[PDB]
């Protein structure tokens, strides 16, 4: 039935639809972008000079 | 589908499972084709980072072909026999 | 225009947080907007009210 | 629902000749499910190879 | 990468829905297009629930 009434309403249905792309238009704005998940262990360097 | 049918009608297994096969042929080589042609891109890619592209592209398009030609085929046959043992199991 | 070339201009406090604004709130404002127009829609079953 | 005409007609030709290679395909796919109900053993030992 | 192979998930699902609608309007007359809708939703949903 959940199904059924959004068939009874298209608007209610398209309203969904813009808000779940404009919510993606700003994830993807704020999303950080990478090559590859770094996997790699945090460093930390100590430097001296003699 | 091939449950449902079974459950509309008394169609013995063969019938069910074959009409269940036909009637999902069409959705299933649809989806086949559509994204066939959506990772052929990936296989033909070339240009930064192909040998990757490549490497993905081909493992899927090879999985997918596979998949539609053998495993359409083969899950009818897997439903027969998986109803004919419940039939064995009732005896 | 006063200064020579070794003169080199800076910015604090809130002049300085006016000028490396990103500007982000505007377009966060008409979206906001946006959404209040499309749950207006929503109930109302209509594109115009 | 808001977007389909109810009994589309009038195809044009090259998708009605893609149609009929589907017809065709699913009647031997019907003969081949058939082939492969029919014998069961033979088909499960090529599963086990594969 | 996981996205541009899921453009193939987001089409099957549609895909099979829409196929089911038109089957419903073109085997059936006298079927409104939305009752099509509700028809072929009420049939299908339990599968793309799953």
């Given at each position: 039935?959940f199904?059924?009434?959004?068939?009874?309403?298209?608007?209610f249905?398209?309203?969904?639809?813009?808000?779940?792309?404009?919510?993606?238009?700003?994830?993807?704005?704020?999303?950080?972008?990478?090559?590859?998940?770094?996997?790699?262990?945090?460093?930390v360097?100590?430097?001296?000079t003699? | 589908?091939?449950?449902?049918?079974?459950?509309?009608?008394?169609?013995?297994?063969?019938?069910?499972?074959?009409?269940?096969?036909?009637?999902?042929?069409?959705?299933?080589?649809?989806?086949?084709?559509?994204?066939?042609?959506?990772?052929?891109?990936?296989?033909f890619?070339?240009?930064?980072?192909?040998?990757s592209?490549?490497?993905?592209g081909?493992?899927?398009?090879?999985?997918?072909?596979?998949?539609?030609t053998?495993?359409?085929?083969?899950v009818?046959?897997?439903?027969?026999?998986?109803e004919?043992?419940?039939?064995?199991?009732?005896? | 225009q006063?200064?020579?070339?070794?003169?080199?201009?800076?910015?604090?406090?809130?002049?300085?947080?006016?000028?490396?604004?990103?500007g982000?709130g505007?377009?966060?404002?008409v979206?906001?907007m946006?959404?209040?127009?499309?749950?207006?829609?929503?109930?109302?079953?209509?594109?115009?009210? | 629902?808001?977007?389909?005409?109810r009994?589309?007609?009038?195809?044009?030709?090259?998708?009605?000749?893609?149609?009929?290679?589907f017809?065709?395909?699913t009647?031997?796919?019907?003969?081949?499910?058939?082939?492969?109900?029919?014998?069961?053993?033979?088909?499960?030992?090529?599963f086990?190879?594969? | 990468?996981?996205?541009?192979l899921?453009?193939?998930?987001?089409?099957?699902?549609?895909?099979?829905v829409?196929?089911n609608?038109?089957?419903?309007?073109?085997?059936?007359?006298?079927?409104?297009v939305?009752?099509?809708?509700?028809?072929?939703?009420?049939?299908?949903?339990?599968?793309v629930?799953?």
């Amino acid at each position: 039935m959940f199904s059924k009434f959004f068939i009874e309403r298209p608007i209610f249905a398209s309203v969904v639809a813009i808000i779940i792309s404009i919510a993606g238009i700003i994830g993807l704005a704020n999303l950080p972008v990478e090559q590859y998940p770094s996997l790699t262990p945090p460093t930390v360097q100590v430097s001296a000079t003699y | 589908f091939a449950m449902e049918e079974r459950l509309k009608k008394g169609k013995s297994i063969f019938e069910a499972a074959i009409n269940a096969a036909k009637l999902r042929f069409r959705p299933i080589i649809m989806t086949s084709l559509a994204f066939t042609f959506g990772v052929l891109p990936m296989i033909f890619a070339t240009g930064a980072g192909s040998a990757s592209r490549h490497s993905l592209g081909t493992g899927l398009i090879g999985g997918m072909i596979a998949a539609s030609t053998l495993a359409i085929f083969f899950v009818p046959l897997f439903f027969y026999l998986l109803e004919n043992f419940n039939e064995w199991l009732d005896k | 225009q006063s200064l020579g070339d070794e003169y080199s201009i800076a910015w604090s406090g809130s002049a300085y947080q006016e000028v490396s604004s990103k500007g982000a709130g505007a377009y966060a404002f008409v979206l906001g907007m946006i959404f209040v127009f499309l749950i207006l829609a929503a109930q109302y079953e209509r594109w115009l009210m | 629902a808001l977007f389909l005409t109810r009994n589309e007609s009038k195809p044009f030709y090259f998708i009605q000749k893609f149609n009929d290679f589907f017809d065709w395909s699913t009647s031997v796919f019907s003969s081949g499910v058939a082939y492969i109900l029919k014998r069961t053993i033979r088909f499960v030992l090529v599963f086990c190879i594969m | 990468f996981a996205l541009v192979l899921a453009i193939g998930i987001v089409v099957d699902d549609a895909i099979i829905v829409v196929e089911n609608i038109d089957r419903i309007l073109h085997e059936d007359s006298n079927i409104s297009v939305k009752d099509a809708a509700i028809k072929a939703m009420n049939e299908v949903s339990s599968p793309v629930i799953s």
